[PDB]
Ligand binder design. Structure first.
Ligand SMILES: CCCCCCC/C=C\CCCCCC(=O)OC[C@@H](O)CO
Ligand SMILES: CCCCCCC/C=C\CCCCCC(=O)OC[C@@H](O)CO
Ligand SMILES: CCCCCCC/C=C\CCCCCC(=O)OC[C@@H](O)CO
Ligand SMILES: CCCCCCC/C=C\CCCCCC(=O)OC[C@@H](O)CO
Ligand SMILES: CCCCCCC/C=C\CCCCCC(=O)OC[C@@H](O)CO
Ligand SMILES: CCCCCCC/C=C\CCCCCC(=O)OC[C@@H](O)CO
Ligand SMILES: CCCCCCC/C=C\CCCCCC(=O)OC[C@@H](O)CO
Ligand SMILES: CCCCCCC/C=C\CCCCCC(=O)OC[C@@H](O)CO
Ligand SMILES: CCCCCCC/C=C\CCCCCC(=O)OC[C@@H](O)CO
Ligand SMILES: CCCCCCC/C=C\CCCCCC(=O)OC[C@@H](O)CO
Length: 447
């Protein structure tokens, strides 16, 4: 007769579980670039800083794309509950791999492991949350809200803890901290799920029928075949540097959506571009803005990675406010494409803001941290409008995020100290201009 804030106790298991995975994940991201910069300056890794930035970006991209595969493997083959478990193990392993004395050798293994891991875990945890409520129940809206608040809790404290740890005991002890985080998540999951989750999800809910096996295999086989063929063809011509490999992945990512657009509502062709653009800016925060914090701000008294805490902090502060807004502005609303429009403008503003300090002071010194503070605040305000309503204006919503990041892999190469004021301005203005185009067509789309 004890609930977790009104909700079934099972929610608390899924809360704790997803909260530590988000911890391991955003904790790692918050120092991964800097770590990669560290490797470079010691001779162990032979890439440029720009390429490192593009590895941070494409890494994100493949995590998002993998998520769309993950629901399938769960539902037709191994079952949802074990999927989350072994996703969790694969993730724990990537982190362990980094916290060991090796160098660049490990880095690539680790990246593969977390990509496949997060692929299994991330979509299926959301699913299992749906499982807690009868499809008649209306606590479900409260439930998902709570669960999401746990996602952002973990994201928020992770840079604080891991960033500190890195400063004190170095990079390897900091990465192990993320392994342990995922481990705690696993412990709560295993034992708490035997107590609080349905055993009906120990199995795929839609097993392959006998005649379906051979087809599936033929497809997977052709897929890998051609992919291997492309890699082979690439290494003959002499296209074997890392940026060439990133370029291949950038391609694969873009193709998949394009390829699936192949006329009742072609409405979202411009809405999708809008989403895709927004995520690119938001995702640059952990790369470009991360880079700006290490180089253009005075962060001698604190761990620079602590800035990464600002993104999930504003989502939490903004959340109770906007919950109220859609009730207290109930009768006469911004339509869903007014929302995309305004959102994208605000993301555009967060970058223009960043053009100012260089325009005014030049690019040769340091500036107040608060610039970043203001930037982050503007973009999250943009996310508030886009992330909730956009969902049902579901494969594709994991996909807009992946396309956005794939694009970063190419654009963040252009950022640097001399290009600063231009980069922020072209992107910035570029985005506002597409947003105003979207308030106009906001009318014609509805259908
Ligand atoms: C659709 C996107 C690709 C997702 C990757 C799928 C995994 C790759 C190959 C799976 C083929 C193995 C078949 C497993 C299986 O359950 O055998 C059928 C068995 O249940 C007899 O009914
Ligand atoms: C770098 C490549 C590593 C990939 C290794 C692949 C491992 C993926 C998942 C781990 C085992 C999941 C299946 C375990 C299970 O309980 O189901 C077994 C059986 O039902 C499958 O038909
Ligand atoms: C329950 C899961 C356990 C998670 C794994 C625990 C972490 C294991 C080893 C990480 C500690 C550092 C190992 C040695 C090391 O190179 O530390 C860095 C130090 O040598 C300075 O470079
Ligand atoms: C599964 C869908 C595949 C569609 C493939 C379409 C295009 C395929 C190959 C063309 C580009 C391959 C990689 C690009 C590249 O290496 O350029 C970088 C190089 O110029 C720098 O050395
Ligand atoms: C509360 C919202 C505030 C939003 C701020 C509005 C945007 C302000 C400035 C954006 C453009 C500044 C860059 C001006 C510029 O083009 O400088 C280039 C050159 O002339 C000097 O480097
Ligand atoms: C609800 C609105 C309250 C807060 C709004 C934030 C302020 C609005 C626009 C700020 C644009 C940049 C300001 C430029 C500036 O102050 O430069 C001078 C700076 O060096 C301080 O000396
Ligand atoms: C909300 C109001 C936004 C403020 C308006 C945008 C202008 C922001 C900064 C302007 C600084 C000077 C404008 C560009 C500039 O650098 O011109 C000076 C040039 O001769 C030497 O760089
Ligand atoms: C939410 C908190 C955001 C952080 C607030 C940023 C403003 C606080 C401090 C600004 C920089 C000065 C730090 C103290 C310091 O050591 O100044 C350096 C000294 O050499 C003065 O020249
Ligand atoms: C069917 C739609 C076709 C439109 C393709 C969408 C855009 C594709 C790729 C982005 C181009 C970025 C151009 C800048 C760039 O990456 O070059 C700089 C750097 O990569 C040097 O290698
Ligand atoms: C068709 C829709 C496209 C709308 C805009 C798409 C992306 C928005 C702005 C692109 C940012 C430009 C990045 C390159 C750049 O800033 O070059 C100037 C500077 O870097 C000198 O090299």
């Amino acid at each position: 007769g004890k609930t977790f804030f009104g909700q079934p106790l099972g929610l608390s298991t899924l809360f704790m579980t997803e909260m530590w995975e988000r911890f391991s994940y955003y904790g790692m991201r918050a120092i991964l670039l800097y770590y990669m910069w560290f490797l470079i300056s010691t001779g162990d890794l032979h890439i440029t800083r720009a390429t490192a930035a593009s590895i941070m970006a494409i890494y994100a991209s493949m995590v998002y794309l993998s998520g769309t595969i993950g629901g399938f493997v769960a539902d037709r083959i191994i079952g949802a509950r074990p999927a989350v478990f072994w996703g969790g193990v694969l993730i724990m392993l990537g982190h362990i791999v980094l916290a060991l004395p090796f160098g660049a050798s490990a880095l690539f293994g680790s990246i593969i492991l977390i990509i496949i891991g997060t692929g299994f875990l991330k979509p299926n945890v959301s699913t299992l949350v749906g499982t807690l409520y009868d499809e008649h129940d209306r606590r479900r809206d409260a439930g998902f809200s709570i669960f999401v608040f746990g996602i952002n809790l973990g994201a928020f404290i992770a840079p604080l803890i891991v960033g500190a740890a890195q400063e004190a005991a170095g990079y390897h002890v900091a990465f192990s901290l993320a392994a342990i985080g995922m481990f705690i998540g696993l412990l709560v999951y295993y034992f708490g799920g035997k107590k609080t989750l349905d055993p009906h999800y120990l199995r795929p809910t839609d097993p392959l029928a006998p005649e379906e096996v051979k087809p599936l295999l033929v497809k997977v086989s052709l897929a890998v075949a051609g992919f291997i063929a492309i890699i082979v063809v690439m290494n003959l011509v002499g296209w074997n540097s890392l940026p060439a490999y990133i370029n291949l992945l950038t391609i694969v990512a873009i193709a998949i959506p394009v390829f699936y657009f192949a006329l009742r509502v072609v409405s979202y062709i411009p809405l999708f571009i809008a989403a895709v653009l927004f995520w690119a800016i938001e995702e640059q925060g952990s790369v470009v803005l991360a880079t700006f914090a290490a180089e253009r701000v005075d962060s001698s008294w604190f761990p620079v990675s602590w800035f990464q805490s600002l993104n999930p902090l504003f989502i939490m502060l903004y959340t109770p406010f906007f919950a109220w807004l859609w009730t207290a502005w109930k009768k006469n609303q911004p339509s869903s494409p007014t929302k995309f429009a305004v959102g994208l403008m605000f993301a555009g503003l967060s970058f223009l803001l960043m053009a100012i300090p260089g325009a005014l002071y030049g690019t040769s010194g340091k500036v107040s941290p608060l610039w970043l503070v203001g930037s982050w605040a503007l973009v999250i305000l943009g996310e508030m409008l886009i992330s909730p309503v956009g969902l049902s204006v579901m494969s594709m919503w994991f996909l807009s995020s992946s396309v956005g990041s794939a694009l970063n892999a190419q654009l963040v190469t252009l950022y640097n100290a001399k290009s600063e004021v231009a980069y922020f301005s072209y992107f910035g203005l570029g985005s506002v201009v597409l947003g105003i185009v979207l308030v106009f067509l906001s009318k014609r789309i509805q259908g």
